[PDB]
Amino acid sequence: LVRSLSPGDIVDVTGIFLPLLTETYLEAQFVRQHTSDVEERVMELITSGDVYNRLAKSIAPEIYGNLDVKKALLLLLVGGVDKRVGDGMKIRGDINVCLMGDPGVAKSQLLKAICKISPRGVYTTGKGSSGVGLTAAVLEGGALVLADNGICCIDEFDKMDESDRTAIHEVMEQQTNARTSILAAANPLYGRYNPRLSPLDNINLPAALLSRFDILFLMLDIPSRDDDEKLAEHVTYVHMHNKQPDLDFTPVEPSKMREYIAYAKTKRPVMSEAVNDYVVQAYIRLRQDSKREMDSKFSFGQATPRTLLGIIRLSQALAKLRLADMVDIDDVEEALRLVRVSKESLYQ
Amino acid sequence: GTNVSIQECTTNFRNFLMSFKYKTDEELYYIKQLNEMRELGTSNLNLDARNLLAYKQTEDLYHQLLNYPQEVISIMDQTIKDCMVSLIVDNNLDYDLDEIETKFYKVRPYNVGSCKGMRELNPNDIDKLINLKGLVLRSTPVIPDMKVAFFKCNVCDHTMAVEIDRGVIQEPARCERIDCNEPNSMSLIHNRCSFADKQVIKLQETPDHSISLCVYDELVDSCRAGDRIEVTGTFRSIPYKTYVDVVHVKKVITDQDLAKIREVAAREDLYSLLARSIAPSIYELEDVKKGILLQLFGGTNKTYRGDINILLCGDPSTSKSQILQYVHKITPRGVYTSGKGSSAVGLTAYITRDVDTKQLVLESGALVLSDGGVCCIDEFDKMSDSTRSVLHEVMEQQTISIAKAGIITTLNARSSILASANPIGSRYNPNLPVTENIDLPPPLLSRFDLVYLVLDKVDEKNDRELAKHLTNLYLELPVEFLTMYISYAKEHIHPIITEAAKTELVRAYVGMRKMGTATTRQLESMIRLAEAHAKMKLKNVVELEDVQEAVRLIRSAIKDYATDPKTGKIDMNLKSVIQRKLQEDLSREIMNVLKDQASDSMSFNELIKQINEIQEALSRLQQEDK
Numbered sequence: 006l007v008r009s010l011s012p013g014d015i016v017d018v019t020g021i022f023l024p025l026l027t028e029t030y031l032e033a034q035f036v037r038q039h040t041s042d043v044e045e046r047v048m049e050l051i052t053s054g055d056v057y058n059r060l061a062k063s064i065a066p067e068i069y070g071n072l073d074v075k076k077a078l079l080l081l082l083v084g085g086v087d088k089r090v091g092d093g094m095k096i097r098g099d100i101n102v103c104l105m106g107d108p109g110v111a112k113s114q115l116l117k118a119i120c121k122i123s124p125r126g127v128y129t130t131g132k133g134s135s136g137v138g139l140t141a142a143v144l145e146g147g148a149l150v151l152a153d154n155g156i157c158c159i160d161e162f163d164k165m166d167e168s169d170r171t172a173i174h175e176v177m178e179q180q181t182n183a184r185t186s187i188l189a190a191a192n193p194l195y196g197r198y199n200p201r202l203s204p205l206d207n208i209n210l211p212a213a214l215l216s217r218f219d220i221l222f223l224m225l226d227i228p229s230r231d232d233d234e235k236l237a238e239h240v241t242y243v244h245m246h247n248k249q250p251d252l253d254f255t256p257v258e259p260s261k262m263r264e265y266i267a268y269a270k271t272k273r274p275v276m277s278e279a280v281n282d283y284v285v286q287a288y289i290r291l292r293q294d295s296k297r298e299m300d301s302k303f304s305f306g307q308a309t310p311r312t313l314l315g316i317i318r319l320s321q322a323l324a325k326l327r328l329a330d331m332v333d334i335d336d337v338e339e340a341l342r343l344v345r346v347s348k349e350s351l352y353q
Numbered sequence: 354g355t356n357v358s359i360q361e362c363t364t365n366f367r368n369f370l371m372s373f374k375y376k377t378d379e380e381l382y383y384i385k386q387l388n389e390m391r392e393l394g395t396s397n398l399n400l401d402a403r404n405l406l407a408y409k410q411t412e413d414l415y416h417q418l419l420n421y422p423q424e425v426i427s428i429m430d431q432t433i434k435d436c437m438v439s440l441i442v443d444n445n446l447d448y449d450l451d452e453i454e455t456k457f458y459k460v461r462p463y464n465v466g467s468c469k470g471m472r473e474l475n476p477n478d479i480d481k482l483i484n485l486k487g488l489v490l491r492s493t494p495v496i497p498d499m500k501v502a503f504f505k506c507n508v509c510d511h512t513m514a515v516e517i518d519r520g521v522i523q524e525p526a527r528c529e530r531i532d533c534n535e536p537n538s539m540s541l542i543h544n545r546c547s548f549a550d551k552q553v554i555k556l557q558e559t560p561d562h563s564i565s566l567c568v569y570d571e572l573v574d575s576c577r578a579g580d581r582i583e584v585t586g587t588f589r590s591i592p593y594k595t596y597v598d599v600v601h602v603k604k605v606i607t608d609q610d611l612a613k614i615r616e617v618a619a620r621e622d623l624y625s626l627l628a629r630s631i632a633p634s635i636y637e638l639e640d641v642k643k644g645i646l647l648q649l650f651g652g653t654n655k656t657y658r659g660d661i662n663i664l665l666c667g668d669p670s671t672s673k674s675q676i677l678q679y680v681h682k683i684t685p686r687g688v689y690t691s692g693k694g695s696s697a698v699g700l701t702a703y704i705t706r707d708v709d710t711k712q713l714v715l716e717s718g719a720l721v722l723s724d725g726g727v728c729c730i731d732e733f734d735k736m737s738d739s740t741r742s743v744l745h746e747v748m749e750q751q752t753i754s755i756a757k758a759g760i761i762t763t764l765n766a767r768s769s770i771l772a773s774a775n776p777i778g779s780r781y782n783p784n785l786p787v788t789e790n791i792d793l794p795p796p797l798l799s800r801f802d803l804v805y806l807v808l809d810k811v812d813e814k815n816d817r818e819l820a821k822h823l824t825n826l827y828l829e830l831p832v833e834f835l836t837m838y839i840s841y842a843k844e845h846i847h848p849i850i851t852e853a854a855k856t857e858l859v860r861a862y863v864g865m866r867k868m869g870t871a872t873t874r875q876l877e878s879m880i881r882l883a884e885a886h887a888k889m890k891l892k893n894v895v896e897l898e899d900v901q902e903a904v905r906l907i908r909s910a911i912k913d914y915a916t917d918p919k920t921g922k923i924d925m926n927l928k929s930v931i932q933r934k935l936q937e938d939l940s941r942e943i944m945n946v947l948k949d950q951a952s953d954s955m956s957f958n959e960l961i962k963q964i965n966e967i968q969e970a971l972s973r974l975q976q977e978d979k
């Protein structure tokens with residue numbers, strides 16, 4: 006029976022429980038370890054339609070209408086497609102999104118929601134817990150190792166120590182295992198944001214780490230009577246009634262949302278030659294014009310192969326979100342749409 | 354019982370000892386060595402145990418011997434003495450036999466087939482012969498152990514000689530003399546006994562974790578710290594700690610592979626193929642392919658090391674982490690480190706004394722663990738100043754000297770360093786001098802052999818060239834050959850610089866010297882890279898072509914042609930009037946030389962060598978019918 010047990014195994018073991026005080030032990034005798042049903046629900050989801058937006062609308066209806074931001078959460082939850090090219094060279098299948106914004110907007114609730122939705126999500130605030138929260142200790146792995154093949158949500162990312170951020174960069178680059186999708190939330194370095202300054206000036210993080218992100222949405226708590234009137238009515242109804250004021254919409258339950266994501270995870274879309282030329286055409290078109298954006302010094306970052314590969318991962322996610330066997334142009338345009346939408350927050 | 358039969362096994366080995374050959378390769382192996390062993394004044398033989406798998410019946414013995422190694426070796430000891438006696442006096446070839454006959458011998462098989470690894474062994478595999486490999490770390494001092502006990506009778510001074518059998522001390526009860534018979538009169542004298550050396554050597558074992566080895570007699574102090582080791586001994590765990598009673602220690606492909614190597618060695622696109630095949634994910638970058646590759650080839654080591662080191666000063670969006678992460682895998686196993694996540698202790702070591710061993714012990718850091726190999730240091734611009742101070746002695750003597758409280762010693766960390774460093778700020782700024790774009794002091798920046806300035810330009814044409822390469826690669830030479838090539842090149846080729854190649858270095862270095870930061874550090878690169886190019890060429894001497902190409906590589910890596918000699922700034926673009934005049938003057942002279950010779954025309958190959966000591970200029974003349 007030896008070598009039938011290994012550490013970390015959730016097992017059912019039958020044995021003889023054996024021993025004026027007597028210490029006790031057990032001699033093992035037997036060792037064991039621990040779809041049309043869901044397809045009908047998928048058929049109902051297909052019957053309802055609007056799968057791309059229904060899932061995004063279903064993500065935390067108690068949170069204000071950041072639909073384009075929550076769409077990034079849907080693709081991050083789905084994730085991209087890994088590509089072991091060969092010779093040991095690797096391309097990550099994960100999606101990294103940052104959530105910058107002023108305090109008091111309760112943005113951490115979305116971090117709770119996404120971590121709750123994901124079956125392998127790990128939540129973390131500020132610096133690592135007692136230091137051992139990152140890397141491993143004499144080994145007991147940290148949060149990043151715990152979220153392997155999962156999602157890590159971080160609140161107040163900028164306050165992390167250099168050692169804390171050093172381990173972050175390796176995982177963000179090598180995924181070791183610590184295969185994770187990183188969702189970060191951070192308050193402005195000055196307490197309150199200044200749009201007149203560059204995002205790097207208003208945050209502790211440098212460009213070396215931000216360039217590793219896919220989508221870098223910024224939240225500006227701009228005082229506006231028009232927008233705040235809807236948000237206040239939205240929130241005050243959430244407290245009054247156990248559902249969002251948009252009762253016309255029926256959200257998808259988290260188990261079904263999780264199941265479809267798992268169903269999506271099985272698929273593998275592949276690029277066609279038609280979209281292949283479209284991707285390089287859009288990349289060249291966007292990269293050349295993005296030179297003016299960086300020259301204006303009023304944009305988050307210059308167009309680099311981060312944009313080309315970022316769209317590829319997002320297009321793969323969108324195609325895999327649609328359960329498509331191959332990637333189509335509309336996924337690329339939608340991916341390009343969301344990327345361009347993220348820049349709009351800087352111009353409020 | 355015992356699988357070993359006393360007479361059967363000695364007869365089986367006797368047939369092997371007189372009839373073995375490998376398949377001039379036809380000569381018998383030990384028919385020659387038997388005379389050499391009788392010549393030797395040695396006391397033991399390191400048996401070529403790979404012969405056991407090279408012969409049929411010997412492998413059958415190995416499986417039988419897997420559980421009874423001691424008995425055969427003890428028989429072989431007497432066999433060796435009998436073989437010596439028979440060859441000396443029975444064959445009448447020698448007469449010096451007295452010391453050999455009285456003394457004792459041993460035999461040590463050194464290349465037995467390896468077992469299923471350490472952690473895969475089983476409780477019944479204990480006491481079985483095994484073969485393992487690993488790295489030695491620490492050594493205990495000489496520990497003597499009892500072999501003979503000396504007893505003197507405390508009332509009559511009679512002396513007895515008592516020897517230990519199977520680790521048992523037997524105290525005599527009475528004096529053995531007829532008259533003196535007092536009970537318990539025998540007493541032990543500590544310093545009249547006989548002892549044998551026992552040493553514990555610590556090995557970092559990699560199965561086919563660290564295991565504390567054990568050695569005895571002449572095997573002690575033969576293994577010292579840092580030795581590369583293969584183990585032929587006995588796995589042991591006794592009432593339970595895991596340890597190996599080392600019987601012998603080793604202090605350290607097909608001809609079809611040679612044919613495969615020569616094909617790549619002969620083909621003209623060798624350098625082009627290597628760049629095309631080393632990194633499929635990275636597009637083009639011919640010089641960067643040549644750069645890191647020359648780091649892996651390395652220069653020659655003489656006593657002066659060939660540890661080529663490279664700094665990637667590229668823009669912070671060019672795939673360079675995609676390289677060094679890949680380099681850590683393809684290269685012979687090294688260490689992947691980040692300057693941000695490393696410290697002086699993390700790179701070098703932590704050294705402390707030991708109560709038991711009474712000599713210094715080392716906890717090897719990242720840098721030392723890469724001894725003799727290749728290491729990658731990402732985030733080199735973010736390394737701490739104290740840690741950066743270590744590299745000065747590392748990149749000048751490959752040693753590290755420590756003198757602190759209670760510890761004064763020097764180490765060795767011979768290794769190659771691959772460094773990548775982002776420019777100061779969010780992007781490279783060519784409006785500033787290059788030495789101001791790099792956050793490294795001149796003393797440290799000068800000692801690197803190669804610095805590469807990889808810049809990304811926003812060009813629509815070049816974007817499509819890169820984009821279509823990657824976009825179709827993720828639809829739907831091998832690493833085994835590449836590692837086989839590099840290991841072959843490092844194994845054999847030790848090129849020597851020729852006289853012609855030597856003299857050209859003087860003009861090459863002086864030319865950079867008069868344009869001044871051309872310290873003598875860059876002159877090290879003018880030989881280190883030269884040897885590594887010949888090693889790739891597999892030419893056993895360094896050619897002048899290797900010299901000039903390496904100089905060009907240094908020029909191209911630093912981009913001297915695109916750098917302002919006044920302020921060190923870089924040209925963004927890197928039809929002109931100087932191009933016009935050179936073409937005009939060239940065309941004027943071609944029209945004369947083509948007709949000055951006593952012919953209406955001549956071969957263009959000879960014409961080029963006549964004036965260069967051109968095709969466009971003559972094509973234009975052909976368009977004008979001249």
Ligand SMILES: Nc1ncnc2c1ncn2[C@@H]1O[C@H](COP(=O)(O)OP(=O)(O)O)[C@@H](O)[C@H]1O
Binds near residue numbers: 311636819
């Ligand atoms: N020439 C190139 N070939 C392949 N991939 C590239 C190239 N340039 C940029 N990339 C991509 O851009 C991303 C940036 O990674 P890299 O430049 O290696 O490190 P960093 O993110 O620190 O700049 C990588 O995922 C890489 O795949």
Ligand SMILES: [Zn+2]
Binds near residue numbers: 511528
């Ligand atoms: Zn006596």
